[PDB]
Amino acid sequence: SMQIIHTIEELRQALAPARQQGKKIGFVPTMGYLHKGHLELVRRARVENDVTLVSIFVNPLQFGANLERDAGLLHDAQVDYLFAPTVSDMYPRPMQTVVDVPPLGNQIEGEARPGHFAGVATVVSKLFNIVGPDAAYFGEKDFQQLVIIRRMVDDMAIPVRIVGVETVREDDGLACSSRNVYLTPEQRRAAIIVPQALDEADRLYRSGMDDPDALEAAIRTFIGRQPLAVPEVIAIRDPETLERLPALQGRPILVALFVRVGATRLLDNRVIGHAAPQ
Amino acid sequence: SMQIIHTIEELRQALAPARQQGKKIGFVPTMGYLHKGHLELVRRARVENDVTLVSIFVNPLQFGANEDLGRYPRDLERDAGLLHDAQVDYLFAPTVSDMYPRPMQTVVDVPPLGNQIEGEARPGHFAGVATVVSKLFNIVGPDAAYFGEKDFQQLVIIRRMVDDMAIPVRIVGVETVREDDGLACSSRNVYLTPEQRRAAIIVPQALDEADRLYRSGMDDPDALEAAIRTFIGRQPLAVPEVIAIRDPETLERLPALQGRPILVALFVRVGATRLLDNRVIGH
Amino acid sequence: SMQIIHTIEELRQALAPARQQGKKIGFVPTMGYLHKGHLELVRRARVENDVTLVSIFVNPLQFGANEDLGRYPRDLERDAGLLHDAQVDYLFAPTVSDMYPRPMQTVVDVPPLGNQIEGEARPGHFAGVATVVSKLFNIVGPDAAYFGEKDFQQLVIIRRMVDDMAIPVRIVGVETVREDDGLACSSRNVYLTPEQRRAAIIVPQALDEADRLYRSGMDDPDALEAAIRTFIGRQPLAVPEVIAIRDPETLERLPALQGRPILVALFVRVGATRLLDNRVIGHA
Amino acid sequence: SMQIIHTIEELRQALAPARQQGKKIGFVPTMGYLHKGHLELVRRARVENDVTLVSIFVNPLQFGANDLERDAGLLHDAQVDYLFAPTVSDMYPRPMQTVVDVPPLGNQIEGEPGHFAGVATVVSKLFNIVGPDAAYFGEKDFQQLVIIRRMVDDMAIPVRIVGVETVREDDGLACSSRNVYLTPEQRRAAIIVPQALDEADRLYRSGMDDPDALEAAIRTFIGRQPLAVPEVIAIRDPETLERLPALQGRPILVALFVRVGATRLLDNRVIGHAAPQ
Ligand SMILES: Nc1ncnc2c1ncn2[C@@H]1O[C@H](COP(=O)(O)OP(=O)(O)OP(=O)(O)O)[C@@H](O)[C@H]1O
Ligand SMILES: Nc1ncnc2c1ncn2[C@@H]1O[C@H](COP(=O)(O)OP(=O)(O)OP(=O)(O)O)[C@@H](O)[C@H]1O
Ligand SMILES: Nc1ncnc2c1ncn2[C@@H]1O[C@H](COP(=O)(O)OP(=O)(O)OP(=O)(O)O)[C@@H](O)[C@H]1O
């Protein structure tokens, strides 16, 4: 049976026998509201580790200053431990410590801002300290986050392997997300334009397109065919630095889409192309 | 039980004790989706060494910008089941992130051997191969590594690389393992429809043709080539991008054939699949 | 024989048997040029742990653009010799390339503690410290780590960082070790010329005086600061960069002194040497 | 006393029991003409390792296609365990067809194409031959070091690469086998080299923010000395060796190539250091 723990000290004691046995611990951090993508993270973790731990915590540090279902899904997925702390279990007094990766975090949505991704980097560093995992699994769906965590892990010599899992998609191609539920039936069928826009970006790249503005314009007009879909951001960037590119061909590129359908923000991304020998 | 390992650090730690105790490590690098031919490399490795390690990594460096990297077949679960049964000690199965945490700026290449034959059709290809293989050898530190003769240019290039760079590994070439009806086993064969799979028998027969032609006393590189390019023309589906007659050692073109081994190398596309096959003929 | 190691991967491989045997690992992080204070941290570590690891690394991140990184004292042969005598099991002595093989893009900071006091005179200094200390704890994975109370603010920050980030290390503060005339032991003391070294006794003397004034009942923080300033100014070779009278836990300014403990923190420049010393005076 | 070995198979036999015992092997590759500099490289290797091995080899792959006594002497005094002194035929029995290069790094400063392929290839071969735990190089040759570090990372070569601070003469001038060629007048003029780096240091400390301004200030400073002609003043990112958009708030490489009469003198300094983000 999956054990549910709430406190840091209870988690540490719960894992002490796995540590004594030299068991590999796989960790999937989440904010709950679990869907099939989360379950594929769990499935990867279980393939590669002896023990699998999922956290559910809605972290206030990644928002501004202002469950039985989930457990059931994790129970059926054969998870060994669910860590579900309250805010007070995680933060009994306010955090004064901040971890950030400013040069990556200030890209894309991170524009020119405070630590847009400080909350994420901080809470993930803390969760790694609590869990002591061997490997941690994240969706490629949240690409910027993943690049940031990798960098943080390398810089800080955190002894955890970071595994990026390919985006899991509903059967019409729409990226799995808990926000998909909000879409009206009409909006849901319009939403298919997002994954189709990525296929179009791939087609254009394979045909030789080399100017990032031309790719952005193509994608914008493509999505625009569906008037219920308004592209808020179409980011074409280096997948390593997340910076703008002077050209596209001969190198891999990240195409990140931020698209509003009705009131709902839909996100998707794909890395297109790959590196040649020097 | 076979241990599946995903990182360079973990793999070296796993192998460190055996290496200290002088145990022989045999290594079979692959791009996965394993077939009878891979399993023969693994058997050779198993009988010849104390410790057997197989790598499964679809190496992006050896795929061109418009080739089949996106659709290259992958099934690690299946691959792993086959390797457990084969009594493999270690499966190294890294993600791209584990093999190439940063974009590679270093390249290993053997331009004389690599720019011709398949490398005319696929520029950069063998630099990708030579690079990943040098890195794999550095990671694993094997005593012996096992490559199939079906990828004959590859094998010659790796032998030369290993020699030139004084890499302390014994390189072992293993005879092309063939399906029931003579076709060279290859993961990419799964792109072929039944019709194409029937049409692909051209390629092994074409090598049997140049076999007896050489045995008949033929002696002109180009007369051997044209006899091949028309013997394969008999099957319409085949769109040869390379028919090559070469010195099996230097891969350079010849003046005459008789009384010297020649290599016949066929890069023949049928449908969406670029089928490769080779034979060394004579002595 | 003490093992001397230079790379992260090498250190983790050297400590793996220890973890396999359930040994407790004591950790003392330093910037080298070791003094008696360092050696007391080591002695304290060895009492409580099976294996003791010292790091020596002059961390560029905790030096500002125009500080003394280039001249900070270094003598690894002398340090190694002292640690061998001290029965240390591991010395981790990386170069900058071994600690930072590529430029860091990550930072750890505790801004509400780190921007006060010494942090007012050295902007960013404590982000440098938090960052390297977090990395070293990841690299070493110790059961306990030992820090001098002489760097009082640093200790407060490291304890807070450890609690905040749930880092599973016990943090031990070690009482300040002093030279015979009361000067806090510090590797930078080697900068002091004879005349500066003689003048430097004004720092511990000023803390004595702070204590004296507090015992007499002085209750006004501004008055205490002003008295300490005048007392130090009697030594023309000493220039106070910070005289801070603070809450010892929050490091914030106080309204009154009596009936609670106060931190008196002095950062005082004598020539090219900025001396630091601290004392917690009174009680709750 | 120091063994001298010439062939690959001999070198491997020599090291095999040391390697079996987990002894740490420190390796110092050279082309001979040894000075105080090389001896520091060797001192470091000996402090950090149980067995020290120095190679002397004038690699043709570095050069265009068209005294072992004094050296081995100093190495015997320095207590080196092994000298590896192959002939061109011992290293390259047949001609090399394999090439290792790090083109993005190799195509900067001195490389503008293939310029550092010779060095990468020989260092890779040497590492394969010796199988060392650590290898020591002078920071004098910065570009080389940065390239070798990248190659080792990219190729997963299990060797620690250690950069050693440039050994310097009485007056600051960088130790070099090229120094012997200066006339005494030229040698007194040559101090302008490290003085130009000090001045580089000074201008950066004073807040100079533009790399062309710095280059022109350094050009002019070296002009003060007519026996000294500056061929190249490279102000670059020490990681990528590329030109910089600005100087302040980031470390900078200042690499000088200066002509003093006939002889080429090189020196460099990384100025500044990384602050927290
Ligand atoms: N029909 C076959 N018979 C024998 N060996 C084969 C056959 N097909 C492939 N092989 C060998 O199995 C090994 C793995 O081949 P695969 O196509 O999986 O990629 P790979 O080239 O081996 O990996 P890399 O190119 O990165 O070394 C190769 O050495 C290949 O020559
Ligand atoms: N006089 C002293 N008595 C007791 N401990 C001291 C004394 N002087 C320094 N220390 C302690 O020795 C340890 C090492 O100090 P050092 O000056 O070498 O830099 P550090 O602060 O230790 O290293 P880092 O800042 O990277 O943590 C510190 O914890 C410091 O507080
Ligand atoms: N003044 C110096 N201080 C420290 N090291 C130096 C100095 N001058 C040269 N060196 C170093 O000595 C080492 C070998 O020098 P040498 O020029 O003899 O061979 P090399 O060209 O480095 O060998 P290879 O390029 O084949 O590796 C190099 O790492 C070089 O940077």
- DSSP sequence for chain B: -PEEE-SHHHHHHHHHHHHHTT--EEEEEE-SS--HHHHHHHHHHHHH-SEEEEEE---GGGS-TTSSTTT----HHHHHHHHHHTT-SEEE---HHHH-SS----EEE-HHHHSSTHHHHSTTHHHHHHHHHHHHHHHH--SEEEEETTSHHHHHHHHHHHHHTT---EEEEE---B-TTSPBP-GGGGG--HHHHHHTTHHHHHHHHHHHHHHHT---HHHHHHHHHHHTTTSTTEEEEEEEEE-TTT----S--TTS-EEEEEEEEETTEEEEEEEEE--
The CA D136 to ligand 3 mean position distance, Å, reads 9
DSSP annotation of D168 reads B
DSSP annotation of D159 reads -
Concerning whether B84 is annotated as a catalytic residue, the answer is no
Residue pair A155/C136 in contact (Cβ under 8 Å)? The answer is no
Residue pair C9/B7 in contact (Cβ under 8 Å)? The answer is no
Q: Is the dihedral of CA D117, D118, D120, D121 positive or negative?
A: positive
CA separation for the pair B95, B8 (Å, rounded): 11
Residues facing residue B102 across a β-bridge: none
Q: Å resolution of this model?
A: 2.1
- Ligand 2 atom closest to C178 (CA): 1
- Cα D259–D260–D262 angle (5° rounding)? 85
CA separation for the pair C204, C279 (Å, rounded): 9
List the single residue in D with minimal CA-CA distance to B23.
Answer: D20
CA separation for the pair C228, C266 (Å, rounded): 9
DSSP per position, A233-269: EEEEE-TTT--B-S--TTS-EEEEEEEEETTEEEEEE
Residue pair B139/B114 in contact (Cβ under 8 Å)? The answer is no
**Where is the domain boundary, B178, B207, B230?**
B178
Residue pair B129/B11 in contact (Cβ under 8 Å)? The answer is no
Helix pair B125-140, B152-164: axis angle to 10 deg: 60
CA separation for the pair C17, C23 (Å, rounded): 9
Q: Which helix (H) or strand (E) is C39 found in, with range? A: helix C36-48
Nearest Cα to Cα of residue D132 among D262, D26, D221: D26
DSSP annotation of D131 reads -
Does residue B64 share a domain with residue B164? Answer: yes
- Ligand 3 atom closest to D30 (CA): 19
Give the three-class secondary structure for C132.
helix
Contact partners, residue C159, CB within 8 Å, separation at least 6? C171
Q: Structure tokens of B113?
A: 């051997």
CA separation for the pair B64, B123 (Å, rounded): 8
DSSP annotation of D174 reads B
Does residue B30 share a domain with residue B159? Answer: yes
The CA C184 to ligand 2 mean position distance, Å, reads 11
φ/ψ bin of B112: left (φ > 0), alpha (ψ from -120 to 50), beta (otherwise): alpha
CB-based contact D98 B161, cutoff 8 Å: yes
Q: State the greatest distance between any 2 C-alpha atoms of chain A, in Å, as a whole number.
A: 59
Is B36 labelled a binding residue? yes
Using the Cβ of B75 and the Cβ atoms of chain C, whether some distance falls under 8 Å is answered with no
Question: B248 to chain A nearest CA, in Å?
Answer: 26
Does residue C192 share a domain with residue C95? Answer: no
Using the Cβ of C261 and the Cβ atoms of chain D, whether some distance falls under 8 Å is answered with no
Does residue D12 share a domain with residue D144? Answer: yes
How far CA D24 is from CA of C55, D131, D155, in Å, comes to 20, 10, 21
Residue pair B137/B169 in contact (Cβ under 8 Å)? The answer is yes
Q: Structure tokens of B66?
A: 């418009």
Count how many Cα atoms sit within 13 Å of the Cα of residue B201 in the half-sphere of its side chain: 8
Residue pair B147/B42 in contact (Cβ under 8 Å)? The answer is no
Q: Is residue D274 in a domain?
A: no
C52 lines ligand 2 (CB under 6 A): no
Residue pair B94/B57 in contact (Cβ under 8 Å)? The answer is yes
Neighbouring C-beta atoms of residue C267, cutoff 10 Å: 21
Contact partners, residue D203, CB within 8 Å, separation at least 6? D214, D217
CA separation for the pair D46, D49 (Å, rounded): 5
Q: Is residue C126 in a domain?
A: yes
Nearest Cα to Cα of residue D27 among D200, D177, D164, D174: D164
Q: Structure tokens of A167?
A: 């985006």
Residues facing residue B281 across a β-bridge: B262
Burial B24-62 (b: 16+ CB within 10 A, else e): bbbbbbbbbbbbebbbbbbbbbbeebebbbbbbbbbbbb
CA separation for the pair D145, D168 (Å, rounded): 18
C184 lines ligand 2 (CB under 6 A): yes
- What are phi and psi for residue D138, nearest 5 degrees? -85, 145
Residue pair B26/B48 in contact (Cβ under 8 Å)? The answer is yes
Does residue D206 share a domain with residue D155? Answer: no
Residue pair C90/C125 in contact (Cβ under 8 Å)? The answer is no
D29 lines ligand 3 (CB under 6 A): yes
Q: Structure tokens of C281?
A: 């005076």
C55 lines ligand 2 (CB under 6 A): no
Helix pair D117-130, D8-20: axis angle to 10 deg: 50
Residues facing residue B54 across a β-bridge: B28, B91
Nearest Cα to Cα of residue D152 among C3, B163, C7: C7
Q: Which domain CATH number covers C267?
A: 3.30.1300.10
CA separation for the pair B136, B129 (Å, rounded): 10
Contact partners, residue A63, CB within 8 Å, separation at least 6? A119
Q: Structure tokens of A2?
A: 């999956």
CA separation for the pair A123, A133 (Å, rounded): 15
Nearest Cα to Cα of residue C110 among C58, C64, C153: C153
Q: Are strands D25-30 and A25-30 parallel, antiparallel or unpaired?
A: unpaired
Q: Structure tokens of A268?
A: 């998707």
Give the three-class secondary structure for C268.
strand
Contact partners, residue A133, CB within 8 Å, separation at least 6? A25, A26, A27, A53, A160
Q: Is the dihedral of CA D271, D274, D275, D277 positive or negative?
A: positive
How far CA C246 is from CA of A173, C154, C226, in Å, comes to 60, 14, 14
Residue found by looking up tokens 């820090």 in the block: C147
Q: Which candidate in B97, B107, B125, B132 is best for mutational testing of the A interface (most A CBs within 10 A)?
A: B97
Helix pair A143-155, A118-131: axis angle to 10 deg: 60
Question: C127 to chain D nearest CA, in Å?
Answer: 6
Give the three-class secondary structure for A207.
coil
Does residue C115 share a domain with residue C167? Answer: yes
* The length of chain A, given as a count of residues: 278
Helices (H), chain A: 8-20, 36-48, 68-76, 87-90, 102-105, 118-131, 143-155, 185-190, 193-206, 212-224
Residue pair D2/D68 in contact (Cβ under 8 Å)? The answer is no
Q: Is residue D275 in a domain?
A: no
CA separation for the pair A250, D96 (Å, rounded): 29
- What are phi and psi for residue D208, nearest 5 degrees? -60, 130
Q: Which domain holds residue A79?
A: 3-169
Question: B182 to chain A nearest CA, in Å?
Answer: 34
Round the CA-based radius of gyration of chain B to a whole number and report it. Answer: 19
Helices (H), D107-206: 117-130, 142-155, 184-189, 192-205
* The length of chain D, given as a count of residues: 277
CA separation for the pair B221, B257 (Å, rounded): 7
**Where is the domain boundary, A122, A148, A169?**
A169
**Where is the domain boundary, C125, C147, C178?**
C178
List the single residue in B with minimal CA-CA distance to C9.
Answer: B9
Residues facing residue A269 across a β-bridge: A256
Residue found by looking up tokens 């941290």 in the block: C41
Contact partners, residue A171, CB within 8 Å, separation at least 6? none
Residue pair C204/C185 in contact (Cβ under 8 Å)? The answer is no
Q: Is residue D247 in a domain?
A: yes
Q: Are strands D51-56 and C25-30 parallel, antiparallel or unpaired?
A: unpaired
Round the CA-based radius of gyration of chain D to a whole number and report it. Answer: 20
How remote is the C-alpha of D273 from its chain's centroid? 21
Q: Structure tokens of D33?
A: 């003409």
How far CA D253 is from CA of B277, D144, D161, D249, in Å, comes to 52, 14, 19, 13
* The length of chain C, given as a count of residues: 284
Q: Structure tokens of B255?
A: 């003046």
B41 lines ligand 1 (CB under 6 A): yes
Does residue C251 share a domain with residue C157? Answer: no
Contact partners, residue C184, CB within 8 Å, separation at least 6? C37, C150, C176, C177, C178, C203, C204, C275, C276, C277
Helices (H), D190-242: 192-205, 211-223
Nearest Cα to Cα of residue A128 among A152, A97, A104: A152
Does residue C59 share a domain with residue C166? Answer: yes
Q: Structure tokens of A199?
A: 């296929």
- Cα B251–A276–B65 angle (5° rounding)? 90
How far CA B216 is from CA of B147, B220, B258, B282, in Å, comes to 32, 12, 10, 11
Q: Which ligand is nearest to the CA of B36?
A: 1
Does residue D202 share a domain with residue D83? Answer: no
HEC readout, C52-120: EEEEECCCHHHCCCCCCCCCCCCCHHHHHHHHHHCCCCEEECCCHHHHCCCCCCCEEECHHHHCCCHHH
Using the Cβ of C138 and the Cβ atoms of chain A, whether some distance falls under 8 Å is answered with yes
Residue pair B143/B125 in contact (Cβ under 8 Å)? The answer is no
The CA B156 to ligand 1 mean position distance, Å, reads 13
Give the three-class secondary structure for C238.
strand
Q: Are strands B262-270 and B273-281 parallel, antiparallel or unpaired?
A: antiparallel
B133 lines ligand 1 (CB under 6 A): yes
Residue ranges with strand state E in C129-284: 144-148, 170-174, 238-246, 262-270, 273-281
- Ligand 1 pocket: which of B27, B28, B30, B72 to mutate (most atoms within 8 A of CB): B30
List the single residue in C with minimal CA-CA distance to B9.
Answer: C9
Domain tally, chain B: 2
- Ligand 2 atom closest to C132 (CA): 26
Using the Cβ of D8 and the Cβ atoms of chain B, whether some distance falls under 8 Å is answered with yes
Neighbouring C-beta atoms of residue A32, cutoff 10 Å: 16
* The length of chain B, given as a count of residues: 283
Neighbouring C-beta atoms of residue A199, cutoff 10 Å: 12
CA separation for the pair D103, C19 (Å, rounded): 43
Neighbouring C-beta atoms of residue B93, cutoff 10 Å: 19
Q: Is residue A275 in a domain?
A: no
How far CA D97 is from CA of A126, B158, B208, C17, in Å, comes to 51, 11, 33, 44
How far CA A101 is from CA of C62, C105, C214, D74, in Å, comes to 18, 6, 45, 49
Residue found by looking up tokens 């010494």 in the block: C118
Residues facing residue A27 across a β-bridge: A53, A136
Residue pair D217/D203 in contact (Cβ under 8 Å)? The answer is yes
How far CA A240 is from CA of A147, A148, A245, in Å, comes to 7, 10, 11
Side chain identity, residue B192:
L
Does residue C183 share a domain with residue C152? Answer: no
Does residue C51 share a domain with residue C145? Answer: yes
CA separation for the pair B53, B144 (Å, rounded): 10
CB-based contact C108 A130, cutoff 8 Å: no
Q: Which helix (H) or strand (E) is C46 found in, with range? A: helix C36-48
Q: Which domain CATH number covers D92?
A: 3.40.50.620
Neighbouring C-beta atoms of residue B147, cutoff 10 Å: 22
CA separation for the pair B35, B32 (Å, rounded): 9
Residue pair D140/D37 in contact (Cβ under 8 Å)? The answer is yes
DSSP annotation of C184 reads B
DSSP per position, D60-128: TTTS----HHHHHHHHHHTT-SEEE---HHHH-SS----EEE-HHHHTSGGG---TTHHHHHHHHHHHH
Does residue D202 share a domain with residue D78? Answer: no
CA separation for the pair B25, B142 (Å, rounded): 5
Residues facing residue C92 across a β-bridge: C5, C55
Hey, which chains touch C, using 3+ CB pairs under 8 Å? A, B, D
Contact partners, residue D146, CB within 8 Å, separation at least 6? D105, D238, D239, D241
Helices (H), A113-142: 118-131
Residue found by looking up tokens 């670029």 in the block: B274
Q: Is residue C284 in a domain?
A: no
